[PDB]
């Protein structure tokens, strides 16, 4: 019942907010939450949030946040983790632009 | 900022309640992901709590009903109880945030 | 989760390579992270996504190693590195730590 995690790039090639959509899927009985962090430091990201869709026995959510089309292609790493409290699982994943 | 800066009464007795307290300096205490970890005097360390940026805390198995980890908002400040100190409480306590930003530490003496 | 380094300390000259080996019971898959202690000085992490870099770290080192078996690779050591790294491992929420690998001059 641990989450898995996938990020998603949703960007054309021209440089210069572009948005990046994290979802999570397959997980939380009772709740679990997602935090941003770029290159390993968090609080400098905020995203959307959306409700639970469940499906009786699991649910999927995500969640969107615009980043600055001047940070993408420099290289910054971009990651989404999300943690659940139950089961005291943590997962993430890790995106890049290509400079 | 990433200033985090530890505060205890550096030394207490066997019986006496211990309680230390981190200032944390730049971001905020709100985005959460704040954790309190100790090292013993040997090289190991091990981790003992968690505060969420919802109030939620989480405790690690073996110091059971003990930790009560809180933080006070508008200090911005966290802090530790660990009731009695049992003197094997004797590690160095470091504020940590997660692994992104490690402070400032301090022991504790328990002696009598 | 138990974690243990393969060896508690090195020696190394200056400019050459160094490595760490960090051992760990059960699959952690790439939830790990490096620390650089300082003696005197607040410590400070790196690596600390799952094997990818962290803001500021030096280009000396990056992350390694998978499941159960990870490693620390610095090559060209220079100035004062010459301290513990721990291996943390946080895939499972009761958070582990191991000891960590002193680094000597020669």
């Known amino acids: 019942v641990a989450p898995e995690v996938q990020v998603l790039h949703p960007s054309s090639c021209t440089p210069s907010s572009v948005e990046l959509l994290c979802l999570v899927t397959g997980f939380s009985p009772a709740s679990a939450e997602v935090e941003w962090l770029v290159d390993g430091v968090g609080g400098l990201l905020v995203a959307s949030q959306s409700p639970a869709v469940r499906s009786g026995s699991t649910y999927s959510l995500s969640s969107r946040v615009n980043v600055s089309g001047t940070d993408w292609r420099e290289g910054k790493s971009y990651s989404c983790r999300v943690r659940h409290p139950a089961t005291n699982t943590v997962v993430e994943d890790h995106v890049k632009g290509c400079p | 900022e990433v200033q985090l800066q530890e505060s205890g009464p550096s030394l207490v007795k066997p019986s006496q309640t211990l309680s230390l307290t981190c200032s944390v300096t730049?971001?905020?205490?709100?985005?959460?992901?704040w954790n309190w970890i100790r090292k013993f005097p040997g090289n190991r360390l091990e981790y003992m709590g968690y505060?969420?940026?919802?109030?939620?805390?989480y405790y690690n198995p073996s110091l059971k009903s003990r930790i009560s980890i809180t933080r006070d908002t508008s200090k911005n400040q966290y802090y530790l109880q660990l009731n009695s100190v049992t003197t094997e409480d004797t590690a160095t306590y470091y504020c940590?945030?997660?692994?992104?930003?490690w402070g400032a530490g301090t022991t504790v003496t328990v002696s009598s | 989760i138990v974690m243990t380094q393969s060896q508690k300390f090195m020696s190394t000259s200056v400019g050459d390579r160094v490595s760490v080996t960090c051992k760990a019971s059960?699959?952690?898959?790439?939830?790990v992270g490096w620390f650089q202690q300082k003696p005197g000085q607040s410590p400070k992490s790196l690596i600390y996504?799952?094997?990818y870099r962290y803001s500021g770290v030096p280009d000396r080192f990056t992350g390694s190693g998978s499941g159960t078996d990870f490693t620390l690779t610095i090559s060209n050591v220079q100035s004062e590195d010459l301290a513990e790294y721990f291996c943390?491992?946080?895939?499972?929420?009761?958070?582990?730590f191991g000891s960590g690998t002193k680094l000597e001059i020669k």
């Open positions: 940590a945030r997660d692994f992104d930003v």
């Open positions: 730049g971001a905020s205490i709100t985005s959460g992901y």
């Open positions: 505060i969420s940026y919802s109030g939620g805390t």
């Open positions: 059960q699959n952690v898959g790439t939830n």
């Open positions: 996504s799952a094997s």
């Open positions: 943390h491992q946080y895939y499972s929420y009761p958070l582990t």
